[PDB]
Design a protein around this nucleic acid. Structure first.
Ligand SMILES: Nc1ncnc2c1ncn2[C@@H]1O[C@H](COP(=O)(O)O)[C@@H](O)[C@H]1O
Ligand SMILES: [K+]
Ligand code: NA
Ligand SMILES: [Zn+2]
Length: 180
DNA sequence: GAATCATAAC
């Protein structure tokens, strides 16, 4: 198949779709995550094309901080009255091209959370905190990630609120109800 | 049987 039409390039299309955009400025766009992993799940993307955190340098430091600020503004404007906790961050090994910041509520109440990979990609070191990535670019000048990230996606399910271990996705979903 | 697992998508 074509490069432009490959599944991995899908964010490049969505980020230009008015129906998916929730905020735009001179630097970034915010879209709804197409397969959200919680009640509120947005992606913040710069207009400028940066393939992934591997291509990030200090020239992009203001941009990463702006993406974070914009993420926090979307939370306030769209979910401020909700009592929800949010995290902002990056997958250590993304699947989709074009750097994108995840802005995600911590209920994890969603039909798109279907497997252990989904869970662990938001609930282990595989989810790099936005602030951590920002600080690493500032102090080290580039983003590095340790070996062994794929193995994290296979860890036993553990609740992010109370650390209880759960034997299955259905049982995890039932358990998470208690933390609403 | 329900759920998970790895694999496959030409
Ligand atoms: N066309 C699309 N528009 C918006 N979000 C998408 C699209 N395709 C995939 N996604 C989401 O993009 C994220 C890609 O994951 P990752 O590359 O691991 O950061 C996931 O949260 C997907 O649900
Ligand atoms: K199995
Ligand atoms: Na992947
Ligand atoms: Zn719990």
């Amino acid at each position: 198949g074509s490069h432009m039409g490959h599944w991995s390039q899908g964010l490049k299309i969505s980020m230009q779709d008015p129906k998916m955009q929730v905020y735009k400025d001179e630097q970034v766009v915010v879209i709804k995550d197409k397969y959200p992993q919680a009640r509120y799940h947005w992606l913040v993307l710069p207009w400028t094309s940066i393939s992934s955190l591997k291509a990030v340098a200090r020239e992009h430091l203001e941009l990463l901080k702006h993406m974070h600020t914009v993420g926090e503004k979307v939370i306030v404007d769209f979910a401020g009255s909700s009592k929800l906790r949010f995290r902002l961050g990056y997958h250590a090994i993304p699947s989709m091209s074009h750097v994108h910041l995840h802005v995600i509520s911590q209920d994890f109440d969603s039909p798109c959370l279907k497997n252990k990979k989904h869970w662990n990609s938001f609930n282990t070191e595989y989810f790099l905190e936005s602030q951590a990535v920002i600080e690493m670019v500032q102090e080290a000048g580039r983003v590095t990630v340790r070996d062994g990230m794929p193995e994290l996606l296979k860890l036993p399910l553990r609740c992010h609120e109370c650390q209880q271990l759960l034997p299955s996705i259905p049982q995890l979903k039932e358990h998470l109800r208690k933390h609403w």
